[PDB]
């Protein structure tokens, strides 16, 4: 079980660790988060009490190094850093644990929520979408734009999601205009799965990462990407049976986890109605259709 120590908490802030969150008061003796489950990516995220604008945070995997948080009074944010000295870090964590100045990652044993939201998400894929190769962890915030959003302005701070565009030469074979537009199977299976992603696991990993950035940071471009990757599958007449069954599980846990009060901003009416009621896969998402109908019948 891994630990992310905090040097201090000089400014009042709501701290998120995956789907959990804690309020910390200005100069509260908070020194970090212990008992973090090994084997998953994690996200540690922040919303300042004095400027709720800019949610921001760090994707990391404790198997890849020893990470800590330290407030930077110049840049005015909580920064993730790597401690390269193993013994210095173990000694910091042991002290803070002994003085019980750390919150415990509050995982209920029955609860597979985080596994289910991050099943396909791999740190190495995150680091290609979020490019800052000198760090092993990845910064994301509310305002970062996607490569696609920038096409339609600082490339170093972009989310490099795979560009999906239904009215693009990439999506439409010359001479198969109507066929490829109404049935996106060649775009899904040849261009995206075989071509770019190599396999369904990488495609699902990007879909899951886009959702989490949409939910945790209200990142609008991430929300667009999550919906585009759903729509590309639901609009394909030919999808492997294992992908449809897995998609139904993925979306079920995403809809289950979404704060009830954010359905209005994070869910696209057109995409969901099309995916559940009109699309080729209208009858292939039983779990998702049932949770959506019971939790968000207004949207539909």
């Amino acid at each position: 079980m891994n630990t992310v120590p905090f040097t201090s908490a000089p400014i009042e802030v709501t701290i998120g660790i995956d789907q959990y969150s804690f309020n910390v008061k200005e100069n509260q003796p908070f020194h970090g988060i212990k008992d973090i489950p090994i084997g998953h990516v994690h996200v540690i995220h922040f919303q300042h009490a004095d400027n709720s604008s800019m949610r921001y945070g760090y994707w990391f995997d404790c198997r890849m190094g020893n990470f800590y948080i330290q407030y930077d009074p110049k840049d005015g944010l909580y920064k993730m850093m790597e401690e390269r000295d193993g013994a210095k870090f173990e000694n910091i964590v042991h002290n803070f644990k002994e003085r019980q100045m750390m919150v415990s990652y509050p995982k209920i044993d029955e609860d597979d929520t985080w596994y289910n939201l991050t099943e396909f998400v791999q740190m190495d894929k995150i680091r290609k979408i979020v490019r800052k190769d000198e760090n092993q962890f990845s910064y994301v915030d509310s305002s970062m734009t996607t490569v696609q959003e920038n096409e339609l302005s600082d490339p170093a701070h972009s989310l490099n999601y795979t560009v999906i565009n239904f009215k693009s030469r990439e999506a439409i074979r010359p001479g198969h205009e109507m066929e490829d537009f109404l049935d996106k199977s060649y775009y899904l299976n040849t261009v995206m799965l075989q071509g770019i992603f190599k396999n369904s696991s990488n495609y699902f990993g990007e879909l899951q990462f886009a959702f989490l950035n949409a939910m945790f940071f209200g990142n609008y471009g991430s929300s667009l990407q999550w919906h585009a990757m759903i729509e590309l599958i639901c609009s394909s007449a030919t999808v492997p049976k294992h992908m449809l069954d897995k998609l139904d599980e993925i979306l079920y846990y995403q809809i289950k986890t979404l704060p009830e009060q954010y359905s209005d901003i994070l869910l696209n009416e057109r995409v969901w109605n099309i995916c559940l009621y009109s699309s080729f896969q209208k009858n292939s998402l039983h779990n998702t259709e049932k949770i959506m109908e019971n939790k968000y019948p207004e949207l539909l």
Binding site: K167, S168, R169, P174
Partner: protein, 237 residues
């Protein structure tokens, strides 16, 4: 964005543009079967593709053979329209290619956009105008070439005959829309107004009669009266 009353003069500027009307592409007669069910029989159709500045009409005849063994024909008709308009643009020399294509029905936007991906600088636009181009098949010579077609065929016309020798494009388009609006509202009465005087003929190379400037004013008046008479019938006002 959308072509409306506000940006109407744009039709007659020097940027090449085409209107595309797909109304008459997929045409059927509905009839009873022997068993008393209902079936359709397709008849020949046409794409109505018009340069409103020059009057050049690219009438692509849609032969009933293009529907044989196809499903969802009203959907296919939009895509076949987009395919043929794309083929027409690619057949034109670069300096004759339109800068804009205005579709008379919003359902043509995606099919035409997808067929025209090779032409990113050609703007595909809808219109808020209610244009009467459905009435093209009330022009006898256009109806005749469509019905007699035994295979796919493109026929080129000038829908303004020689009018641009005497009037501006704006005025020619206004005359055309009034004639087509009348033919659409009351075909019998409109054709009666156009041929009532046997001394005024249609030249072999024309679509409409050879009216003097003064006779066009009288004709245009008779067409406006027909449209209001009919309107005071539809609505009883």
């Amino acid at each position: 964005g959308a072509m409306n009353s506000s940006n109407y003069a744009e039709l007659f500027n020097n940027d090449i543009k085409l209107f595309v009307d797909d109304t008459n592409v997929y045409r059927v007669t509905v009839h009873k079967t022997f068993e008393g069910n209902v079936a359709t029989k397709a008849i020949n159709g046409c794409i109505f593709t018009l340069n409103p500045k020059t009057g050049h009409l690219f009438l692509k005849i849609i032969h009933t053979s293009v529907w044989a063994g196809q499903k969802r024909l009203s959907q296919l008709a939009k895509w076949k329209t987009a395919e043929e308009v794309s083929a027409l643009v690619r057949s034109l020399p670069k300096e004759e290619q339109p800068k804009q294509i205005i579709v008379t029905r919003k359902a043509m936007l995606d099919p035409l956009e997808v067929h025209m991906l090779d032409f990113p600088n050609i703007a595909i636009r809808p219109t808020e105008l209610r244009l009467p181009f459905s009435a093209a098949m009330s022009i006898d010579k256009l109806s005749d070439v469509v019905m007699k077609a035994t295979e796919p065929q493109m026929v080129l016309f000038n829908i303004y005959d020689d009018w641009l020798d005497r009037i501006s494009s704006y005025t020619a388009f206004s005359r055309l829309t009034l004639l087509l609006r009348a033919l659409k509202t009351n075909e019998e009465s409109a054709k009666m107004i156009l041929l009532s005087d046997p001394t005024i003929t249609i030249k072999s190379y024309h679509l409409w009669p050879s009216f003097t400037d003064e006779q066009w004013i009288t004709i245009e008046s008779q067409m406006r009266d027909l449209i209001l008479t009919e309107y005071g019938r539809k609505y009883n006002v």
